[PDB]
Paper text:
The DBD is connected to the C-terminal LBD via a short helical element and a short linker (approximately 10 aa), which was not resolved in the electron density. The LBD shows the characteristic GyrI-like fold of 2 SH2 motifs with a pseudo 2-fold symmetry forming a central groove that is clearly visible in the crystal structure despite the relatively low resolution of 3.6 Å. The dimensions of the groove (length approximately 30 Å, width approximately 10 Å, height approximately 12 Å) provide an ideal environment for accommodating compounds of linear architecture. Despite presenting as a monomer in analytical gel filtration, STM3175 forms domain-swapped dimers in the crystal, where the DBD of one polypeptide forms contacts with the LBD of a second molecule (Fig O(A-C) in S1 Text). The relative orientation of the N-and C-terminal domains of the 2 molecules is not identical, resulting in an asymmetrical dimer (Figs O(D) and O(E) in S1 Text). However, in contrast to other GyrI homologs, STM3175 lacks the highly conserved Glu residue in the center of the binding groove, and the charges in and around the groove are not exclusively negative as in most GyrI-like domains. In STM3175, the groove is mostly lined with hydrophobic residues and extends into a tunnel toward the C-terminus of the LBD. Attempts to crystallize the albicidin-STM3175 complex were unsuccessful, but molecular docking of albicidin to the crystal structure of STM3175 suggests a binding mode where albicidin is positioned in the central groove of the LBD. In the best-ranked models of the complex, the N-terminal half of albicidin occupies the binding domain groove, which is a well-described binding site for other ligands of GyrI-like proteins. The C-terminal building blocks D, E, and F extend through the tunnel toward the C-terminus of the LBD.
RNA sequencing and proteomics data show that this novel mechanism protects Salmonella Typhimurium and Escherichia coli by increasing the copy number of STM3175 (YgiV), a transcription regulator with a GyrI-like small molecule binding domain that traps albicidin with high affinity. Closer inspection of its amino acid sequence revealed that STM3175 consists of 2 domains: an N-terminal AraC-like DNA-binding domain (DBD) and a C-terminal GyrI-like ligand-binding domain (LBD). The affected region harbors the GyrI-like domain containing transcription regulator STM3175 (YgiV in E. coli), which we identify as a critical factor for conferring high-level resistance against albicidin. The protein binds albicidin with high affinity in an equimolar stoichiometry.
Author numbering: -5 to 123, 132 to 287
């Protein structure tokens, strides 16, 4: 049908209700704005008014009022040069000119005084608007490591060997040193006959030689993507998949010739699985 639909008519009436409310706010700024009254003016519940305004305006009432006040102060900066900046900052509801300057630099992109000097209003009109992954330069670390080649489960057993070595040789990766796991392969995709996992601990000097199989090696430094994973060692492969799916296409950076490696800032069983902290590191060239 080409005709007007009852559904669209209702949505239009609702939107224009809330537009009436917006205009009332624009008029009655700098006033005690009782949410009960504004909620009544929208023919809606006081308990749901904020979510509706956030839904449609795109920003809550406190951000909206703040940013309208900031735009008013911007007009006053550019076109009322006689007014003092402290006075303007007080008029916009800010206690200190420093905090007003903070908010201006945060939302606008220019400092207040530079705006008073050369307003770039075009930018202002264009500036109306999950997991943190970072880029760090990992320093090359001499470590002592044991390589496991076999079934992915037996890895735990081999890890025990390393722990035993730490008690026996007096080498202390426990303190003033770090403990990493070089994850060469993904156990599901990779044949468990070739699965390689390196359990390593940081050392300040070489560890001589030992019959257990622990040997000296190094983790090279340079560009490297870091993602903070919170929880189980069984949960790490999914965040590794996250890194590969999301960071590699978007970043456009190229990985270098070293396997993925995790640094356990919180060791396994000393704290709970729910509070365990691991850092996944993707080598980047």
């Amino acid at each position: 049908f080409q005709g007007a639909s009852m559904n669209d008519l209702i949505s239009a009436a609702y939107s224009e209700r809330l537009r009436r409310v917006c205009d009332h706010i624009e008029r009655h700024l700098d006033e005690p704005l009782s949410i009960e009254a504004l909620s009544r003016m929208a023919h809606s519940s006081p308990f749901h008014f904020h979510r509706q305004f956030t839904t449609w305006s795109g920003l809550p009432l406190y951000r909206y009022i703040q940013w309208l006040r900031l735009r008013r102060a911007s007009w006053r900066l550019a076109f009322n040069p006689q007014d003092k900046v402290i006075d303007i900052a007080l008029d916009a509801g800010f206690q200190n000119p420093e905090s007003f300057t903070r908010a201006f630099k945060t939302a606008f992109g220019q400092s207040p005084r530079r705006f008073r000097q050369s307003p770039d209003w075009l930018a202002w009109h264009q500036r109306v608007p999950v997991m943190d992954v970072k880029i760090v330069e990992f320093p090359p670390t001499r470590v002592a490591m044991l390589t496991h080649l076999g079934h992915p489960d037996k890895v735990n057993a081999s890890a025990a060997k390393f722990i035993a070595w730490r008690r026996e040789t007096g080498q202390s990766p426990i303190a003033s040193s770090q403990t990493f796991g070089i994850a060469w392969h993904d156990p599901q995709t990779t044949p468990p006959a070739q699965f390689r996992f390196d359990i390593c601990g940081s050392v300040r000097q070489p560890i001589a030689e030992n019959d257990v199989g622990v040997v000296n090696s190094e983790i090279p430094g340079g560009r490297c993507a870091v993602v903070r994973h919170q929880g189980s060692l069984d949960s790490l492969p999914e965040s590794v998949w996250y890194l590969f799916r999301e960071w590699l296409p978007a970043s456009g950076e190229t990985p270098r010739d070293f396997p993925v490696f995790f640094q356990y800032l919180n060791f396994v069983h000393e704290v709970a699985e729910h509070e365990l902290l691991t850092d996944i590191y993707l080598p980047l060239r």
